[PDB]
Design a protein around this nucleic acid. Structure first.
Lengths: 162, 124, 48, 46, 115, 144, 28, 147
RNA sequence: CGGUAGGGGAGCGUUCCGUGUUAGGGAGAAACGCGUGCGUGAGCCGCGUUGGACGAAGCGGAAGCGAGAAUGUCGGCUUG
RNA sequence: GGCCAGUGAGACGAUGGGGGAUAAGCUUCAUCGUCGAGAGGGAAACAGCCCGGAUCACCAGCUAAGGCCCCUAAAUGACC
RNA sequence: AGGGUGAAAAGAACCCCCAUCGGGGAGUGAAAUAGAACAUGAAACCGUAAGCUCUCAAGCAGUGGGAGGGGGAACCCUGACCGCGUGCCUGUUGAAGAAUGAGCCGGCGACUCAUAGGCAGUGGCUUGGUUAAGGGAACCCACCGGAGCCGUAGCGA
């Protein structure tokens, strides 16, 4: 998100007319901010925000999010997948027979993420597969319908204690 | 009107590409006069606009001669967009989506996906 | 903890006052810089 | 020599009205000339 | 990240409407519509407190005339010797109000005061 | 709506100052067609001719288009309005320069023929109210 | 300058009748 | 509730008379202009003209105390310089008598649009008879022991 | 419980983002007005039109964020 | 003490004084008041004099400084 | 400096006024008071019509009281007459000021960002707190990365 100041705009730096002896304001360039030709005061130039958040706190934001989503009908939980010729029909039907399907964003994740489920999870927009490598605060923070596997239940338990 | 001139990669206007072909027997899909067979006659391939005969009814007016004589009105049939025409054969009288095959020879032709008819037919 | 439900504690953040927007804000006009003088003038100012 | 301040709408409407009206009075004269020029004995307008 | 506005037009239509029947440029010409607005509110104050003060004045003079109607030298002054000496809980210069509606009643008041 | 007792004949940006065309147009408001005709024919005003051409193209535009007379045909409102104005830079001494404008009138005239149901007496008879609406085509100072 | 308003919470009473005015009438 | 407001009063206003034969000028003119305003009416209202016509007669014989009769001067000044016109009360009472009282009340009563309108309610005559029998003018009450 | 310079506290609003291809919406999104509806107020709810396509609320985030004063400035218009 | 301001030529009135000519709405300092930063009533109008201190509403009342013939409220009220 | 008829020119056959400028019908279109100096259309400014009102007037032109009248049948319009009221900002010991500035309307236009020191609010951790550069199946990033900094001992050149 960038812009140009009184110094970059192409307008010239000729005092358009002498200081006194003319009845008119003291305009001093036709590249000035006041004139509507260009020159913005305090425009946006690319700033690079970044917020160092203490690791041991950030963790605890995850642990809080998770630990708040569970135990109130918002954590179904599985143990494995065996899909061959990945086909997005057996999988969505799995969601159906499984927990809550309804394509209502149902965050959903796994361990070691065998390709043949990655490859049939993308078609469905509402639920996105996750791995410890890919874990984010955002999507596990619907507390809506997030699933796990035992690798995640103990991997998870292992990462955070009490 | 500059906002709608033919678009030009270096001296030429992009031609798009449409499934419909001249002499095609089409059903109008949705717009307006939905569900009416026709024979296309003239494809403007840059806009994907296609005039099928005897359907679209535009009541224009024409100053005929140089003394104001005549000038009797003409009734022209104007464009309709290409995504609004499917194919029909009189035998499988039904709309369909196009397809393709490589038949036993080298050549490669249309093939209505919902039926067994062939859109390409003979060369002429 | 849905995204919509979460809120920050009270007093955690204070909106930065924008000087010069209005008299009601109270920093409007002079902005508390008073009238004239080196301090009022824009620039590096007097060295500490 | 140079005016101080613009006049109101009030005043200006007054004077423009006097201008136009000054045109009003000079029609009924032309209307008399018409209503007399409708064919009649007269020595004018060959 | 342009952020241009229209909130002026409402900021200002509102005033433009509070200054109606202001008979000049004071009703059309926004940059003076504002200061006019200010000045109408101010005179609303001063005319309000002055209206309390002003209606007292009006009733004092009105009751004063009704009392002087007795042809002998009475007053709004002396009527109040005699209207507080005899305990009447403050008819509140609204005996000045009946004095014009039920005048016979105000003559009854006045005779009971004289006693 | 006037209900066909009106025939607007709008105008082009007829290339003359608005205000002078307004002194003649104000001259001709209310008078019946015959008078304003014979006046504008002989009026000593430049802005009088195009107004004339307009009027006559309003009578004639209201005799075969609608079908009216001319003897019972008045000028109802006959308004003028400004229009696009052009801007010239004519120069002048000591190097100064002044815009000289160039105005355009924009006239709409609404003639008015006469159509009357005709009522014999003042007395009112709260009857045929649905019909009554048709009957009261035009009234002055109506009440209730 | 201070744009401030004010609602005095009034009460709109209706009066039904008058009583016990018989004693010590001073009317004449 | 709401104070009463002078609601339309046209005519049948009381006409009074004052024979000003030796009645000192000021005091009389105060009790004239108090009946010119209507401050003798429970219907009094500054903004409306609830007053009452009156008639001064024998306007030649108003008295003034002290040495006034040669001292007091009425000055009318023309708009141009040098227009000031010294004029002593004796010269007026000799020359045009009614203007005397016509000043006295015209100072007493409230100048403005309304004051100007009321001043017509004073009819001044230098003779001994007044041509008005309009409301059969009842003589004017004087509450002033010193006249 | 007056208050300029000035300091502190509590808020509204505008464009955009998260919750969203949200709720709602061609029986109709915004500018104009009737409601002294409502607020201490910045402003908010409703209410209508030839046109007429988008977009609230709530809990949060960011600011090219709030104008009658710069002999400002760009455009349109007047006065004489 | 911390974090942070603005201010830096005030004006007049009372008093004690210097300078001046015991001249200035002059100037310069010391102790207080008002204005500055403060409304309202008296003073005709009238920052710096008198009473007095404004949170708001009230078509309620008692007073202060000042006043009671008319314009404007209130005795053209008493007696010397 | 100059952008936005319509979904499709279907951009107006025919008629009349007619110097073929510009119009009114007819026709097209859902709509052309969308008709080609055409898409929503604010304000200044120019008119028109209706309601009430000004010619012995005096006024930063409003306000409190409201005569008379008109409106749909207690609220809104106008205002006879009375009272009070010495524009707004900057800036001054002190301005309504005959000190400044602004013709009006609408917009554009001013304490911002980067990194660092200090202080306060909030949170995480703690018999320690934190990682930076750098990696991470892109960029964000879970995890790694302890080099480094701060708190642990002062006095003295």
């Amino acid at each position: 998100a960038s812009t140009l100041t009184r110094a970059e705009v192409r307008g010239g730096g000729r005092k358009p007319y002498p200081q006194k002896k003319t009845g008119r304001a003291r305009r001093g360039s036709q590249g000035s901010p006041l004139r509507p030709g260009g020159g913005v005061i305090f425009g946006p130039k690319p700033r690079d925000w970044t917020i160092k958040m203490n690791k041991k706190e950030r963790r605890l934001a995850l642990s809080t999010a998770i630990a708040s989503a569970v135990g109130n009908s918002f954590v179904v939980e599985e143990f494995a997948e065996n899909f061959e010729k990945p086909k997005t029909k057996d999988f969505i039907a799995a969601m159906q027979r499984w927990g809550l399907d309804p394509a209502e964003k149902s965050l959903f994740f796994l361990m070691d993420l065998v390709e043949n489920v990655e490859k049939s999870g993308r078609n469905i927009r509402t639920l996105k597969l996750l791995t410890p490598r890919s874990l984010n605060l955002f999507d596990v923070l619907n507390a809506e319908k997030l699933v796990f596997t035992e690798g995640t239940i103990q991997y998870l338990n292992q990462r955070y204690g009490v | 009107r500059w906002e709608r001139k033919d678009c030009k990669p270096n001296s030429l206007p992009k031609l798009h590409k449409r499934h419909v072909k001249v002499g095609d027997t089409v059903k109008v899909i949705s717009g307006g006069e939905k569900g009416k067979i026709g024979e296309i006659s003239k494809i403007h391939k840059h806009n994907s606009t296609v005039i099928i005969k005897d359907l679209n009814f535009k009541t224009k007016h024409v100053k005929s001669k140089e003394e104001g004589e005549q000038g009797q009105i003409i009734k022209i049939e104007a464009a309709i967009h290409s995504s609004n025409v499917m194919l029909i054969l009189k035998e499988q009288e039904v709309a369909d989506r196009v397809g393709h095959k490589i038949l036993e020879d080298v050549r490669k032709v249309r093939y209505l996906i919902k039926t067994g008819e062939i859109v390409d037919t003979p060369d002429r | 903890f849905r995204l919509d439900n979460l809120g920050p504690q009270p007093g955690s953040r204070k909106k930065g006052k924008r000087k010069g927007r209005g008299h009601a804000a109270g920093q409007g006009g002079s902005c508390g810089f008073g009238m004239r003088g080196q301090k009022s003038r824009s620039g590096p100012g007097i060295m500490r | 020599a140079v005016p101080k301040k613009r006049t109101s709408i009030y005043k200006k409407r007054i004077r423009k009205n006097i201008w136009k009206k000054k045109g009003y009075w000079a029609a009924l004269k032309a209307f008399s000339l018409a209503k007399s020029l409708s064919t009649g004995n007269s020595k004018s307008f060959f | 990240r342009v952020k241009r506005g229209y909130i002026a037009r409402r900021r200002r239509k509102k005033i433009r409407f509070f200054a109606s029947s202001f008979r000049g440029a004071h009703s059309r010409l926004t940059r003076t519509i504002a200061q006019q607005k200010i000045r109408a509110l101010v005179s609303a104050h001063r005319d309000r407190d002055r209206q309390k003060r002003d209606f007292r004045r009006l009733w004092i003079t009105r009751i004063n005339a009704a009392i002087r109607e007795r042809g002998v030298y009475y007053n709004y002054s002396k009527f109040i010797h005699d209207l507080y000496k005899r305990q009447l809980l403050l008819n509140r210069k609204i005996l000045a109000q009946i004095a014009i509606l039920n005048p016979n009643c105000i003559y009854m008041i006045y005779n009971e005061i004289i006693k | 709506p006037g209900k066909c007792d009106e025939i607007t004949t709008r105008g082009y940006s007829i290339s003359m100052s608005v205000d002078k065309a307004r002194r003649v147009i104000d001259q001709i408001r209310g008078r019946s067609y015959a008078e304003t005709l014979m006046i504008l024919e002989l009026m000593p005003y430049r802005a009088c001719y195009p107004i004339f051409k307009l009027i006559y193209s309003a009578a004639a535009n209201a005799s075969h288009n609608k079908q009216f007379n001319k003897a019972n045909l008045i000028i109802s409102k006959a308004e003028v309005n400004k229009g696009i104005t052009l801007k010239k830079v004519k120069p002048r001494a000591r190097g100064r320069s002044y815009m000289i404008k160039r105005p355009t009138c924009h006239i709409t005239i609404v003639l008015r023929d006469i159509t009357h149901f005709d009522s014999y007496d003042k007395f009112l008879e709260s009857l045929t109210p649905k019909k009554l609406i048709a009957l009261l085509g035009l009234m002055s100072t109506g009440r209730r | 300058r201070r744009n401030i308003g004010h609602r005095q919470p009034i009460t709109r009473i209706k009066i039904t009748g008058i009583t016990g005015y018989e004693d010590y009438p001073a009317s004449t | 509730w709401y104070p009463k407001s002078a609601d339309h009063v046209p005519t049948d206003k009381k006409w009074y008379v004052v024979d000003a034969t030796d009645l000192i000028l000021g005091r009389m003119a105060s009790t004239i202009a108090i009946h010119i305003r209507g401050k003798n009416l429970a219907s009094y209202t500054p903004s409306v003209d609830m007053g009452a016509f009156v008639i001064v007669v024998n306007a030649d014989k108003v008295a003034v105390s002290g040495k006034k009769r040669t001292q007091k001067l009425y000055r009318r000044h023309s708009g141009r310089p040098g227009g000031l016109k010294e004029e002593t009360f004796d010269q007026l009472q000799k020359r045009i008598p009614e203007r005397i009282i016509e000043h006295a009340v015209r100072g007493m009563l409230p100048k403005g649009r309304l004051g100007r309108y009321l001043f017509n309610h004073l009819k001044v005559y230098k003779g001994a008879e007044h041509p008005h029998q309009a409301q059969q003018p009842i003589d004017l009450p004087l509450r002033d022991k010193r006249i």
